[PDB]
Amino acid sequence: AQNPNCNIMIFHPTKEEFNDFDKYIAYMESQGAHRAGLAKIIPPKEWKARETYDNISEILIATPLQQVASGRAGVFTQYHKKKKAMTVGEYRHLANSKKYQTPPHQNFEDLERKYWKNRIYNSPIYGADISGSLFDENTKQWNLGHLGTIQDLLEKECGVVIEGVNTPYLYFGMWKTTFAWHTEDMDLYSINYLHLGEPKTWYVVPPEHGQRLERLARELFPGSSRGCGAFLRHKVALISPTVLKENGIPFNRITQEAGEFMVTFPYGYHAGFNHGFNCAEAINFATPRWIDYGKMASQCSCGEARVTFSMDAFVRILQPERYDLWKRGQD
Ligand SMILES: O=C(O)CNC(=O)C(=O)O
Ligand SMILES: [Mg+2]
Ligand code: NI
Numbered sequence: 001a002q003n004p005n006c007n008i009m010i011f012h013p014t015k016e017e018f019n020d021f022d023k024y025i026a027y028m029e030s031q032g033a034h035r036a037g038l039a040k041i042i043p044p045k046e047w048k049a050r051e052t053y054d055n056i057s058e059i060l061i062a063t064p065l066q067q068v069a070s071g072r073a074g075v076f077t078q079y080h081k082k083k084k085a086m087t088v089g090e091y092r093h094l095a096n097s098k099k100y101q102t103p104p105h106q107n108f109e110d111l112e113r114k115y116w117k118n119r120i121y122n123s124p125i126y127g128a129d130i131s132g133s134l135f136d137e138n139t140k141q142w143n144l145g146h147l148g149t150i151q152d153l154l155e156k157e158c159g160v161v162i163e164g165v166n167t168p169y170l171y172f173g174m175w176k177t178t179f180a181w182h183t184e185d186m187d188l189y190s191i192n193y194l195h196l197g198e199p200k201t202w203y204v205v206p207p208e209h210g211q212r213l214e215r216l217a218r219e220l221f222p223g224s225s226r227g228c229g230a231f232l233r234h235k236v237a238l239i240s241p242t243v244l245k246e247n248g249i250p251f252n253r254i255t256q257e258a259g260e261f262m263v264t265f266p267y268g269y270h271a272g273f274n275h276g277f278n279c280a281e282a283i284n285f286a287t288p289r290w291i292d293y294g295k296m297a298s299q300c301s302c303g304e305a306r307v308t309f310s311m312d313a314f315v316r317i318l319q320p321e322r323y324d325l326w327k328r329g330q331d
């Protein structure tokens with residue numbers, strides 16, 4: 001078995017190897033990459049997502065989110081308070097302000113320590129989940145706006161034609177902005193490109209050990225657990241590396257820098273934070289190996305997680321028994 005310790009793998013494709021997205025994903029899995037839940041891909045040196053970022057300040061962040069924490073430093077929840085619209089130029093200036101900017105630090109490790117010690121005492125503002133793309137239409141390789149769609153994957157593998165579309169999303173981050181512990185909708189893959197700015201640190205649990213993280217989360221967030229059998233789909237719960245180590249949960253960590261891709265694999269729980277002002281683009285995708293994960297994916301039926309138009313069809317076809325109760329939650 002390849003990669004039996006489930007370490008995060010890093011790949012350096014040539015420009016020749018960068019032409020066929022599906023085939024490269026299948027190559028990474030042949031080497032065991034999926035066992036970690038997360039992989040890094042450094043694009044060939046010849047490749048670029050676009051020519052410059054010089055004219056992005058007029059993108060609108062219609063609903064910036066203030067991420068307010070409750071709990072203790074290593075075990076907390078976050079809620080998202082909606083704020084007034086601002087442009088990316090306005091947001092970048094705010095991120096750079098004395099109130100919100102990255103503190104002095106020695107290296108990524110010292111910054112990680114400061115994040116876990118101090119996150120709960122501040123409320124950073126995240127421009128998340130904005131439909132759109134920063135890839136130039138002429139970028140032909142690994143353009144997250146030109147990928148094969150999950151509806152077309154399901155049709156190719158299973159023969160059924162369904163409604164829905166699949167488009168990318170932009171994320172504008174600042175120091176301390178946080179993504180809570182989750183897997184993707186329907187336990188899909190994700191791919192994330194860091195277009196610009198400061199790094200993003202990731203934590204991940206190997207798919208084969210996901211249930212260990214779920215059991216710890218039920219212990220640590222006991223009222224949330226009683227309210228919903230799939231509450232990590234609410235994307236609100238944080239657990240520190242120290243706490244994970246204390247409870248014997250297998251995990252790994254890595255820092256993504258500007259110009260790098262990350263891939264998350266089906267049922268790979270992940271969480272993380274931004275080091276400073278940055279912009280990432282991400283999209284879900286599928287391969288033939290995902291189908292069985294989609295069939296087994298948990299669902300939120302309490303009504304909090306409230307998800308896309310296109311996830312309807314996935315549930316209807318892959319989970320027809322759940323269909324009914326899940327759409328009661330989504331209506
Ligand atoms: O970048 C973020 O805030 C969150 N991204 C992801 O969870 C992802 O790409 O799967
Ligand atoms: Mg602009
Ligand atoms: Ni994700």
Ligand SMILES: [Zn+2]
Pocket residue numbers: 227228229230231234300301302303304305
């Ligand atoms: Zn729920």
